[PDB]
Amino acid sequence: AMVQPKSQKARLFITHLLLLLFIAAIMFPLLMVVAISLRQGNFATGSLWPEQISWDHWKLALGFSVEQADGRIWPPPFPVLLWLWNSVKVAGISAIGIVALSTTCAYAFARMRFPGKATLLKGMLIFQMFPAVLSLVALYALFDRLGEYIPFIGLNTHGGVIFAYLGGIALHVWTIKGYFETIDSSLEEAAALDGATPWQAFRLVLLPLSVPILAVVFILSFIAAITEVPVASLLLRDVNSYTLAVGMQQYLNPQNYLWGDFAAAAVMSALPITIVFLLAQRWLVN
């Protein structure tokens, strides 16, 4: 609460004006894609902002009805509910696998020490920003070769995309390791003093304290697996096996452009944004 000159009011007003302008500029796409969802047409021609409300595209995405407009019936374009179900299945399995395979590595890298700690840490740092892309050639060849042997992880199946998503261990390992480092250091020494074997000290003391970070990592992995385009698009050739971000690309086709249907589906996929903005932010002191 330091005393400031009269220029403080001018600076505050200018900052508010600039922030409002910037927020309007960044929210133009989202507000528009909301506006298209209520537009009656699907070619976006006429009134850029539709005063009339239609909801034709919304129930088409939901599959509730067919929205009789003329005598002929317009069937639902794509199974968005099926996309959501497949995406949820894959994301849940991948997140469970990532958490299970990451918690022990993070514990070892943060709390206890071993001769290879330094080199292993530099290795994880090196391989963390290596993208899952640039190895799609190898993944495709591997799954083609494994299709005849083990079909449940071969080509055109959810096993392959789940296994590919399991490569995201590295990113979450560092987060869980950071949380473990944040946890106080004398707890293991104390537990050993009461007579706890290091496994007991990890399980009975350190593990129950890691539940918040494990839940956060689970949510983050779930979101990341939901929103991954490249691998799931390369795999999942069949229509019924499409997920979100793979069956969504069919909406915007030059043969049949569907702005209204695509916008309805995108806005209906609203849970992701709320879940991220809430949990990932965790209202942490920034």
């Binding site: 106080d184 004398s186 707890l187 020494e189 104390a190 537990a191 050993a192 003093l193 009461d194 007579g195 706890a196 007991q200 009975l204 003391v205 129950p208 304290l209």
Partner: protein, 371 residues
Amino acid sequence: ASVQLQNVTKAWGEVVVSKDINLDIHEGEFVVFVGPSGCGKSTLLRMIAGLETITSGDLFIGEKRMNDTPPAERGVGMVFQSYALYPHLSVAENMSFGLKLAGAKKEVINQRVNQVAEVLQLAHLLDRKPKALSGGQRQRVAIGRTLVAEPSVFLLDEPLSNLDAALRVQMRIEISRLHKRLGRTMIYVTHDQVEAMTLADKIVVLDAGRVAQVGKPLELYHYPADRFVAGFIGSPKMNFLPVKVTATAIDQVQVELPMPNRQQVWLPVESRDVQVGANMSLGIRPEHLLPSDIADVILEGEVQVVEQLGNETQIHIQIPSIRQNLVYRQNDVVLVEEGATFAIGLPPERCHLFREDGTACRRLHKEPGVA
């Protein structure tokens, strides 16, 4: 419960932190570790506990070689700086984790935790978690955990570094009460000499991982082993005057004051391994400096600082031909202007004579309280 560190040496890689630490703590002695470097004392306490390996030497908890024994079976309870409280467990679980893990009857756990909570004034909060407690309550929880564990030796770190004065005093009072109630062997680590002076049966002074001296508080205050201990004990550093020894008797040493009159004093000193004409450092405590009217030896000087504290006045007088300003403490409020000339008396009996290496010749003068 007699921990008997014998020739214990610790080397962090190549740096030898501890070398031949020969400590003999008898049963039920509140031995305190105090020194300038906090790393050495904490490392020593952790090696005693078992959290750190011993490079060489043998350690004896009680009467059994406990060098390689795992920390659980050493029969020692340690109080950490952070108190090592498990946030997920309640207070009762925090103070009974040891009984729970080893396997104990619910009735036994209840009885022990209830006794400890009652004697530590902890029962009214024995449902809460560490987060919902205060600092003093957390400290009492840690001490109660140790008490429930019932160790042969109580080990305590120094949490006063991260702690403020009010709960520092609460810590001091609680530790004193625990010692007087139990009477078991307990080692404490601190960096403040006032705490060691107030609570100790045998103070151990550590100098860069070396046993400077081991003895009672008044023993250290009255008969320091060397210059390091002499300077360390007592908040106003003892005045050191470089002197030249003239003649040595069988029970006293005659030295020449550096100040230009070259006065000679036959101070009572062990007078062993003393060569005439050698270089030595005389030491006289600020509190023992007599007024100039009472003592035959008079040291003139020019007053620099006249700090008045109400109860006592500390006068920093700069004696000619002496670099240091001889600080002088007198009860009541002596009136003296800065820059004036003030004289003090030098009692020969209270003079500590220090060899050129650092060792102190024993003062033959008897001092009350040393027993």
